[PDB]
Design a protein around this ligand. Structure first.
Ligand SMILES: Cc1cc2nc3c(=O)[nH]c(=O)nc-3n(C[C@H](O)[C@H](O)[C@H](O)COP(=O)(O)O)c2cc1C
Ligand SMILES: Cc1cc2nc3c(=O)[nH]c(=O)nc-3n(C[C@H](O)[C@H](O)[C@H](O)COP(=O)(O)O)c2cc1C
Lengths: 166, 167
C-alpha cells in the first residue's frame, strides 16, 4: 500500500509528530542500501517552529516548511564516502525510505530538493554552520496531513517497458 | 509489514523464473516513485534471456549476481523527459529503492548494481544496448528467488547520526 499511496503532502495540521514516529522515520532512513555499505548519512531533526520557518527560505520550493511541525535535513559526510561517486543515490534511497515510512505512519511528507543546486546547498551550509565535509542533500518536511491524502495516483506507463532490448 | 527493515541485497538466486505478475508489480512500484518536477524520467529494459543476462554481468566488476539471476531490470533515464536535469539520479534512485522494497514484499531477492556515474559502466551499458545519446544508463537490478540468503533485519540504526535542532 505505501508504495502506491505515498504522495507529496505539503500542508499539515498543527499537531507535532510523536517522538516514537520521528524515531521510526530515522530508522527507516538508516535501513537504506548504500554503495559499499558506506552509510554516509547524517540527519538534523527540527521541531523548533521558528527555525523550521526560517528553513523555508532555503529554496523557492520549500513553502511546505511554513506549516510543518517537523523537518529532517538529510546530509552526507564526505569523510565516510568509500564510493563518493554514488553518495546522492545512497541519500535518495534513504529519502525514499523516510517518505514511505511516513505514509505507513499516516503522516504526510515531501522531499524538498537541495543537492546539487548551489544556492540551496550554500543556504543550508550557512544556516547550519556546516563543516566543509558535511554536504547538504535535501530537506523532508513532515506532519499530519491537512486535506491532502496519501492516496493512489496510478503513474504506470507500459511504454516505459522495453522487452530484452531497448 | 516489515519490508523496509528486512530488505537486503541478495546476490545469488534459484533457477525459478520470476512470475510475469511479479515482474509487472516491480515495474509498477518503480513508476510510483517521486521525481523532481514530477518529471518521471525513467525507462526500463527487462531481461529474462539467460544468455543476455549473463552477458550483462560483464558491465561491471560488481555484477556477478547476474550470473544466476533469472531476471534483470536495467534502469535508464531519458534526457528528453527531464525538466530538472540536475536531479535525475535522485529520481532514479527513488525508483530503484521502490523496486527493491517491492521485491522483498513479493518474497524475491534483489540487489542494486550501480552504474551511473562510473564512466566504464555507463559506457558498457550504452554499448550493450546500443542506446541513443539521450538514454542514460542508471543501474541494473538483478532479481530472483533467494538461494542461500534472506530478506532479514540487519539493524543499521545509529543514534549518533541524529542531530537535534542543530548540527
Ligand atoms: C548506489 C548503490 C550502488 C550499489 N552497487 C552495488 C554493486 O555494484 N554491486 C553489489 O553487489 N552491490 C551494490 N550495492 C548494494 C550495496 O552493497 C548494499 O546496499 C550494502 O552492502 C548494504 O547491504 P543491504 O542492501 O543488505 O542493506 C549498491 C547499493 C547502492 C545504494
Ligand atoms: C529529487 C526530488 C526533488 C524534489 N524537490 C521538491 C521541491 O523542492 N519542492 C516540492 O514541493 N516538491 C519536491 N519534490 C516532490 C515532487 O514534486 C513530487 O515527487 C512529484 O510532483 C510527484 O508527486 P508525488 O510525490 O505525489 O508522487 C521533489 C521530488 C524529488 C524526487
Amino acid at each position: 500500500d505505501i508504495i502506491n499511496n505515498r504522495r507529496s503532502i505539503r500542508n499539515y495540521k498543527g499537531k507535532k509528530v510523536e517522538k516514537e514516529k520521528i524515531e521510526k522515520l530515522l530508522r527507516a532512513a538508516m535501513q537504506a542500501p548504500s554503495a559499499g555499505n558506506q552509510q554516509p548519512w547524517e540527519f538534523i531533526v527540527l521541531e523548533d517552529r521558528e527555525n523550521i520557518d526560517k528553513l523555508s527560505n532555503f529554496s523557492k520550493y520549500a513553502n511546505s516548511l511554513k506549516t510543518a511541525p517537523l523537518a529532517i535535513v538529510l546530509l552526507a559526510d564526505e569523510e565516510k564516502m568509500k564510493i563518493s561517486e554514488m553518495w546522492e543515490q545512497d541519500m535518495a534511497a534513504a529519502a525514499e525510505n523516510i517518505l514511505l515510512e511516513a505514509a505507513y505512519l499516516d503522516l504526510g511528507a515531501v522531499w524538498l530538493g537541495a543537492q546539487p543546486i548551489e544556492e540551496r546547498v550554500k543556504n543550508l551550509k550557512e544556516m547550519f554552520n556546516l563543516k566543509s565535509n558535511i554536504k547538504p542533500f535535501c530537506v523532508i518536511s513532515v506532519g499530519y496531513p491537512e486535506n491532502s491524502e496519501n492516496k493512489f495516483i496510478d503513474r504506470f506507463d507500459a511504454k516505459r517497458i522495453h522487452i530484452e532490448k531497448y
